[PDB]
Amino acid sequence: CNTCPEKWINFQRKCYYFGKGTKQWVHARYACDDMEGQLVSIHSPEEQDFLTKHASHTGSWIGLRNLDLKGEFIWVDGSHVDYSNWAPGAPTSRSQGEDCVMMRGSGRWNDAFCDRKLGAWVCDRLATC
Amino acid sequence: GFVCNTCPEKWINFQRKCYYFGKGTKQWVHARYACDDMEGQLVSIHSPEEQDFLTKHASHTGSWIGLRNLDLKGEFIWVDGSHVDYSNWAPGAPTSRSQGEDCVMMRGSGRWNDAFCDRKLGAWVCDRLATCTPPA
Amino acid sequence: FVCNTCPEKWINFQRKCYYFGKGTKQWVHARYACDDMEGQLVSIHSPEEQDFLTKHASHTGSWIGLRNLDLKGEFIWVDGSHVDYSNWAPGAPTSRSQGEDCVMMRGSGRWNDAFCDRKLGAWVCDRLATCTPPA
């Protein structure tokens, strides 16, 4: 079970899309939804390393945010953070309004303002058989 | 760094919950007690992701789930006490004019319909909270 | 996060779970039996832990997870760790090995080296307890 839609890339039981074009966080969410995917969720160092390999050098929106300003970071599939890869000093404690999460070229995570325009974003979905 | 995927034997994990896909003829209330007797509750469903997971494992001939018109106030409420936010009703369900169809079953498609509580179904689904592996 | 959940039939103490097995086994059979239930022959690292084990320890002796690895003269836990805390019986372990390369625990809790092929009626497995999320 590793068949991916055209222009996506397989890793383990998932397919990944590395979108380009300027978007704020929620706009990146809807872009992923338009291709029947979701902004990427990250649950293991293996997956992170795969993501770092293809990652846009200039920063990418990923599927983690401060749901309902609660303020716990929750993946857009409803899953919690088990694996994490924060940049040193991230996430910003409590709590400036940097409520959406981006991934640097290095692969490390940084909490950011949701209205920030980044030039990349990562979607995932389940691979088919 | 805590991974929450531990379930007791015979349960299946999805995110932070564990699920038991029971088999054997039961009416709604008997399914409720079966789930009680094994330290769970009739499943409550809160997201399209949780529903999609349920659909994969769902019995093709229908399963009791933890939703019911209590009591009989006109509102469907989950056994955990929560209200219906996410829903996955089959078209036309629930009736607006109940004559006793006060319990909810999930079809093989995963979609829901209201039903008489003494309907005998071949399946029912329990849930409970998953536990976590400490960071190594 | 509180870590004291055990699978059914195991008992919790602190951050660990314990299984008190019964049935005639050599040390290596008891090792596999623990593996098969997804734990290991117990390793012991504190007095508190020893006190707990002693409360449930089979009167007629139990295999625990300490052994003379390969045959090098060093007793090492199956989890790979060295002996820090210790609770040997008087005159255990034997200075120069005549083959008593495995360790059993008495009802009293105290440890005694023994021939690995000795058949004992009990053995103790452990594993890590799982945790209740903050909810």
Residue numbers in the entry:
A (entry chain B): 160 to 288
B (entry chain A): 157 to 292
C (entry chain C): 158 to 292
Please share excerpts from the published article on this structure.
The second principal receptor for IgE, CD23, is a type II transmembrane glycoprotein with a C-type lectin-like domain (CTLD)4 (3, 4). The interaction between CD23 and IgE is critical in the regulation of IgE synthesis, which can be up- or down-regulated depending on the oligomerization state of CD23 (2, 9, 10). We have determined the crystal structures of the human lectin-like head domain of CD23 in its Ca2+-free and Ca2+-bound forms, as well as the crystal structure of the Ca2+-bound head domain of CD23 in complex with a subfragment of IgE-Fc consisting of the dimer of Cϵ3 and Cϵ4 domains (Fcϵ3-4).
To verify that the principal site is indeed the location of Ca2+ binding to derCD23 in solution, and to confirm the exact nature of the interaction, several single point mutations in derCD23 were generated: conserved residues were mutated within the principal (E249A and D270A) and auxiliary (S252A and D258A) calcium-binding sites, along with the highly conserved Asn-269 residue (N269A and N269D). In contrast the E249A (principal site) mutant, which crystallized in yet another form, has cis Pro-250 in all three independent copies. Here also, loop 4 adopts a similar conformation to that observed in the Ca2+-bound derCD23 structure (and conformation 2 of the Ca2+-free and S252A structures). Mutation of the adjacent Glu-249, part of the EPT motif, to alanine appears to have locked Pro-250 into the cis configuration.
